[PDB]
Write a protein that binds this ligand. Structure first.
Ligand SMILES: [Mg+2]
Ligand SMILES: [Mg+2]
Ligand SMILES: [Mg+2]
Ligand SMILES: [Mg+2]
Ligand SMILES: [Mg+2]
Ligand SMILES: [Mg+2]
Ligand SMILES: [Mg+2]
Ligand SMILES: [Mg+2]
Ligand SMILES: [Mg+2]
Ligand SMILES: [Mg+2]
Ligand SMILES: [Mg+2]
Ligand SMILES: [Mg+2]
Ligand SMILES: [Zn+2]
Ligand SMILES: [Zn+2]
Lengths: 56, 238, 82, 100, 51, 94
RNA sequence: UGGAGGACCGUAAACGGUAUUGAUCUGCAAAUCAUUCGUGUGACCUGCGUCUCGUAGUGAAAUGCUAAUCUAACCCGGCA
RNA sequence: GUGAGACUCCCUGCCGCCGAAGGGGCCAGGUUUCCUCGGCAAUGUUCGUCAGCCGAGGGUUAGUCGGUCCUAAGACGUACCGUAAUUCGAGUACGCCGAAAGGGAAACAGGUUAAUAUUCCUGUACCAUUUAGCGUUUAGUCUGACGUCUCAGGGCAAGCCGAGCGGCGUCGUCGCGCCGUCUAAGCAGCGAACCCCGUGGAGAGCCGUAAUGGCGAGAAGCGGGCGAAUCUGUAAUGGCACAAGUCGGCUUCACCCCGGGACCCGUGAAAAGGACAGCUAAAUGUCCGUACCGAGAACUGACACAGGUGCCCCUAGCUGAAAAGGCUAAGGCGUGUCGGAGUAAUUCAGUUAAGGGAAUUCGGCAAAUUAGCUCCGUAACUUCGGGAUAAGGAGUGCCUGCUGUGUAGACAGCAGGUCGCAGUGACCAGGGGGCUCUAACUGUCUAAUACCAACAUAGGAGAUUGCAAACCCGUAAGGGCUAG
């Protein structure tokens, strides 16, 4: 259908479930990883230095 | 970077260019036989193979294990096969090419001994034994070339079944469409001169022409060997 | 751990008591065997079966059916539901 | 509960009686293609079944031998009789029955 | 009908229990300084992401 | 004998199911191949005409029960015939 | 008699989107409505599941599509 | 009637809407919207005593319904190896997950609540695992387990007709019209086709089918065996105004069983489970879901949104080829949530129009004409298939009495009379022909200004490569094409 409100009626599925380790709704049900804390990918918790300004 | 070509996409192995393996019945190979052994077996049924569009035979051997085999023409349910070194020459048996007489037709020939067979396998093809020197034997391949094979190579005697498959024209896009669903090939294929200059070396322009010569050298980098790859000649015969 | 918290005393639970049945609020992390053994030890009445329900408030209701007639009446008498 | 009011059917019933007699069915009331009103395969099936049952009973009682029975069977398969009375007419004309 | 497991139903029960008007005695004790909480919603609005 | 081969209805044959499509050449080729395929082939054990096509290159005898692999559109091919002739003559010369 | 075909007609079943350059154009709607139309046993339409992604993917090829964004997406950082 | 207050809330009567969807069942999704009582500041395109709104309370019960169990595409984990290195990377071995529409051990009727019911209660059943007793394998096969089209046979829910019995309506005249006349699983019995066996002796030919066909490599015929849906009895006493509760007939899809044929350069899943050795008795059958909506007000698009998801699966009488269009049942509604008054121009969408008939306009744009079925008749050209519904003509209602085919349902045809301006009388329902350009055709395309001559296609030709190949992906380990 149209790219606007006509194709937004098929919006009945879900792509992210709820994570066990952090409780945030960011668990990818296809790749089986949490996109916020990294659960499923690793035993460590996801942190990147680009999640904040260079502190200078 | 103008987009990669179809050949490189096949290289990556994306799901659009991967063969649907689960449809195929079974892999075709010669029975494994130890040194100085000769096992027999009688055909149990004749069956259709979707990976080649030709029949295959199911054979139950004396040890117990059954194997699908490349079916040569004339194979019938009930006949026994005598694969081994001591087999006689008959239509159906598997024998070394060293002790096959000149003029006999063979098929499912191997490259090196105990490969299972790699040459002469499509429908209705066949090869011939020409000469028997002490160390090699020359067989004329279905392409038209002479190949020098080891005398201790195995090949079934006869010609591959299903002869004449390409005497029936498609005359539709639908029938050829249906064949392509059980193969890795993509159908249908766009022509290069109708693409954009990102997509292909030949694309672009206000009218559809190649622009540059179609013959390409053998040393061209990947992503450029499109057209007549290292042709020796062009055109029909005048 | 204790699996029975307290009898449930709404209007529907009262009518179950007519044909010799009760309705307890049990610990939500428990099954039918544990409920059976706890009630049997606590009142000495041989339970017959047990039906369980999870409610939208969070708790977990259980309906006990006894074998000996008039047992539910006197259990409710001593417990103080009456 | 108030009674349900159905749909009366007396008028259609009388009309159906008239049609069953053979009226109210003229060319001006057909609106579907011939074949939609009577498929041809059903016509052939009923015709051939009637013809075969009649020939079989003529063979069974005894007034028709094997040779003429075979000939008439294949002939009716070929489509030279259009009805049972037509077949009886040819049988009683060409004398192929063994009535005495 | 959205067949749920035990945990999903548990979280749904909690989110149900959070839709409550603040008790009247709380408003009396705090002298009309607490009159609402940020957990109030309505079922036909923004969907909750409990599940 | 067969369907009405009128003053016209005689050239297309089995290719008349394609209507006015695909051109004269392809239709003629398919038609001729179909009359070759529909032929009353002969058995090798029975020596009675009973062979029909079961699948792509599979053939069977209706009375005899014999199953074998052959051509895709015709039971016996010329190259197989030549192989039989040559090998049999070699054997019979012994 | 028989019942083939990328055959025919045709539903406001389904899918599509010709013309009115109609209605609306701070709309019912950030692309809809009415009439008129095209396919409708097949290279058909479709539910759920699963896979392929950023100098990469997919494309019966228009520079089309990749979450109202595409001649190189989006979030944050280099960056005041 | 209620209420301080009534176009808007409630009851009765009349008049209406959808009636192959606006009704019924339910997935995903929602998450208490479900029921009762008490309210009307806000929400509701007006008001409101009403409410999917606000406050308080209440409501979901399973050995048999699902999940759970098996595996498909395909994921993930540990090890091995690579990488400067990892949370990164292909393959191999061993595991493990993946379907609430695939496979699958077992339950039906009635009652009860304000809101739950194959779950609770009454009655009648059935299936597994363990323990004890009494015996035993054939253990290797069968089943689960399979495409598209087309057709015969049998059965049945729905539907229709006649007679009797009980109610309701109409009643200016007549005596018709409608509703009801019910009954589950389980258990016991029977078996149509295909197939197997014992006889049989058929050709200058016989036996059959809707059709293909069968036959001394053994037909017809005569016997026996394995073998379905459904049907008959019981369960038969439950429900019904404890009011009747008895019988016959026709048809039957869109549902079930069984068998045949055709087609493929398409061949149309796997595994758990079940069958073959079981019989009797007691005990056990844990866990999770169960309310309500499922959409012109309970989902998604910021909304009580004319879109989309769901037209996903089902549906009565008449007309009719029909699930089309029209008119009515059952069911749901008067909420596709502003009213009163009736009088200008103009505007959106329709009905009709003398005489002329494209003279309008870039252009017959727009609108009109024709339209169903039967019969007669049908051109240039042509790849011999077509063109073709060519073009062009005639008939059609109602009443009376009949004939033919058929087991029947029904279908086809005739003779006479007769009315109207008009007989497919409304609904529905092609305007046709000729000469050129272009692409062979069916198909695809700029979601939201471009449905085309553009793309694709079958057909023709050329080139590389004998497999440790040609072509390509990766830093590597290794891979795609390739079960070739
Ligand atoms: Mg977009
Ligand atoms: Mg820093
Ligand atoms: Mg370039
Ligand atoms: Mg059409
Ligand atoms: Mg920036
Ligand atoms: Mg109506
Ligand atoms: Mg208001
Ligand atoms: Mg339960
Ligand atoms: Mg599982
Ligand atoms: Mg007004
Ligand atoms: Mg075209
Ligand atoms: Mg082109
Ligand atoms: Zn997480
Ligand atoms: Zn034979």
């Amino acid at each position: 259908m149209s790219k606007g409100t006509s194709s937004m009626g098929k919006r009945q599925k879900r792509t992210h479930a709820k994570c066990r380790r952090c409780g945030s709704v960011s668990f990818n049900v296809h790749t089986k990883q949490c996109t916020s804390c990294g659960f499923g990918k690793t035993s460590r918790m996801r942190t990147y230095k680009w999640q904040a300004k260079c502190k200078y | 970077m103008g987009k990669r070509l179809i050949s490189q996409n096949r290289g990556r192995g994306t799901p659009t260019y991967r063969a649907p393996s689960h449809k195929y019945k079974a892999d075709l190979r010669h029975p494994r036989v130890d040194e100085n052994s000769s096992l027999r077996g009688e055909v149990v049924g004749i069956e259709h193979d979707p990976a080649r569009s030709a029949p295959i035979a199911k054979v139950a051997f004396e040890n117990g294990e059954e194997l699908f085999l490349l079916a040569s023409e004339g194979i019938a349910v009930g006949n026994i096969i005598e694969c081994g070194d001591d087999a006689e020459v008959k239509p159906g048996n598997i024998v070394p090419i060293g002790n096959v007489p000149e003029g006999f037709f063979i098929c499912n020939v191997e490259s090196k001994p105990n490969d299972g067979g790699k040459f002469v396998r499509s429908s209705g093809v066949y090869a011939t034994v020409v000469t028997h020197e002490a160390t090699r034997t020359a067989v004329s391949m279905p392409s038209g070339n002479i190949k020098w094979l080891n005398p201790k190579c195995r090949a079934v005697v006869g010609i591959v079944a299903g002869s004449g498959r390409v005497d029936r024209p498609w005359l539709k896009a639908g029938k050829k469409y249906h064949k392509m669903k059980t193969r890795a090939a993509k159908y249908p294929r766009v022509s290069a001169v109708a693409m954009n200059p990102r997509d292909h070396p030949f694309g672009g322009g206000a009218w559809k022409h190649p622009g540059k010569p179609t013959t390409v050298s053998r040393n061209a980098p990947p992503g450029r060997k499109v057209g007549l790859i290292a042709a020796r000649r062009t055109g029909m015969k005048r | 751990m204790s699996s029975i918290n307290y009898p449930f005393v709404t209007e529907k639970a009262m009518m179950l008591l007519d044909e010799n049945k009760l309705q307890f609020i049990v610990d939500t992390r428990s099954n039918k065997k544990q409920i059976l053994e706890d009630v049997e030890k606590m009142y000495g009445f041989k339970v017959k079966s047990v039906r369980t329900m999870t409610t939208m408030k969070g708790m977990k209701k259980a309906v006990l059916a006894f074998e000996e007639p008039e047992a539910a009446h006197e259990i409710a008498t001593r417990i103080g539901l009456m | 509960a108030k009674p349900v009011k159905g749909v009366s059917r007396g008028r259609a019933r009388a009309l159906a009686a008239k049609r069953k007699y053979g009226h109210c069915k003229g060319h001006g009331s057909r609106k579907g293609k011939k074949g939609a009103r009577t498929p041809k395969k059903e016509q052939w099936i009923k015709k051939i079944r009637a013809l075969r049952r009649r020939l079989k009973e003529l063979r069974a009682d005894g007034a028709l031998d094997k040779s003429v029975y075979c000939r008439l069977y294949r002939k009716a398969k070929g489509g030279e009789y259009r009805s049972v009375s037509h077949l009886n007419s040819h049988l009683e004309s060409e004398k192929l029955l063994k009535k005495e | 009908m959205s067949h749920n497991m035990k945990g999903q139903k548990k979280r749904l029960a909690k989110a149900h229990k959070q839709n409550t008007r603040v008790p009247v005695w709380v408003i009396v004790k705090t002298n009309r300084k607490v009159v609402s909480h940020p957990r109030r919603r309505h079922w036909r609005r923004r969907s909750l992401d409990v599940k | 004998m067969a369907k009405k081969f009128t003053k016209k209805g005689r050239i297309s044959r089995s290719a008349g199911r394609f209507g006015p499509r695909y051109g004269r050449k392809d239709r003629k080729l398919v038609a001729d191949l179909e009359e070759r395929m529909r032929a009353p082939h002969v058995c090798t054990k029975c020596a009675r005409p009973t062979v029909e096509r079961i699948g792509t290159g599979i053939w069977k005898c209706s009375k005899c029960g014999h199953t074998f692999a052959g051509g895709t559109y015709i039971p016996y091919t010329s190259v197989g015939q030549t192989l039989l002739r040559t090998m049999k003559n070699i054997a019979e010369a012994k």
